[PDB]
Amino acid sequence: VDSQAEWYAEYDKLEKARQKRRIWKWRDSDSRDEYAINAEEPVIYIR
């Protein structure tokens, strides 16, 4: 039972989850009309 390893592993897991959450929270508008904010996105419109 290596307590130091367990503590560091748990802290790392929580920190990775926090980072992933913050990356996930970066969300631009996904509106089809809003072409300006999403100019680089590859979309095809059938209209």
Binding site: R18, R22, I23, K25, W26, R27, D28, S29, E34, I37
Partner: protein, 205 residues
């Protein structure tokens, strides 16, 4: 700390300061600044002007309440039976009195708020409390015992609620971002954005 030996939390140095670092390389703002109309109405310099600009709201609310009550009375009256009395003569006092009372109360509130702010010279919670108290005192002029205490309190509390959650709250929590790195903690290794997220375009309705 999660221990019983040392105080929880932490301490931050007052001498040491951290130089501000921009949240993103380029900042695009979808929030429009206050309009010139908003600033004009908010100007409390001249109490009479302030009062006359802000009463339209109280008048509208009084008119809506009076229209509601008048409609309720009108709907019940029977079309099939001929009525000796004139319906408009019965209904017009309802609407007029409701509008007048609402306008008077809102005028008292706006006047007292502006006069206190001018005399004190500072924007403060007390100005709203004293305006509310005066409005509630005018509301409870002839009411039984409990109401003189209750209405000055409820009315005084309402500007406190408006100030706390309309002005202090947003300014207090302006810095928080939600993306990239936590506001206080920029040393931590979190993905750094080139541009802020634009979740919606500036509104226009």
């Amino acid at each position: 700390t999660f221990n019983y030996v040392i105080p929880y939390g932490g301490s931050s140095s007052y001498t040491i300061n951290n130089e501000p670092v921009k949240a993103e390389e380029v900042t695009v703002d979808f929030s429009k600044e206050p309009s010139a109309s908003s600033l004009k109405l908010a100007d409390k310099s001249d109490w009479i002007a302030y009062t006359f600009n802000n009463v339209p709201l109280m008048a509208t609310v009084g008119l809506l309440a009076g229209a509601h009550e008048a409609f309720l009375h009108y709907e019940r009256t029977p079309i099939y039976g001929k009525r000796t009395y004139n319906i408009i003569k019965k209904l017009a006092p309802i609407v007029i009195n409701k509008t007048a009372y609402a306008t008077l109360l809102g005028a008292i509130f706006c006047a007292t708020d502006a006069l206190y702010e001018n005399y004190s010279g500072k924007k403060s919670y007390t100005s709203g409390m004293v305006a509310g108290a005066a409005t509630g005192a005018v509301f409870a002029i002839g009411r039984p015992l409990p109401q003189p205490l209750v209405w000055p309190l409820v009315f005084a509390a309402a500007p406190v609620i408006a100030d706390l959650f309309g002005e202090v709250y947003p300014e207090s929590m302006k810095s928080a971002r939600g993306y990239g790195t936590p506001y206080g903690f920029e040393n931590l290794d979190d993905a750094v954005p080139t541009r802020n997220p634009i979740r919606r375009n500036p509104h226009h309705y």
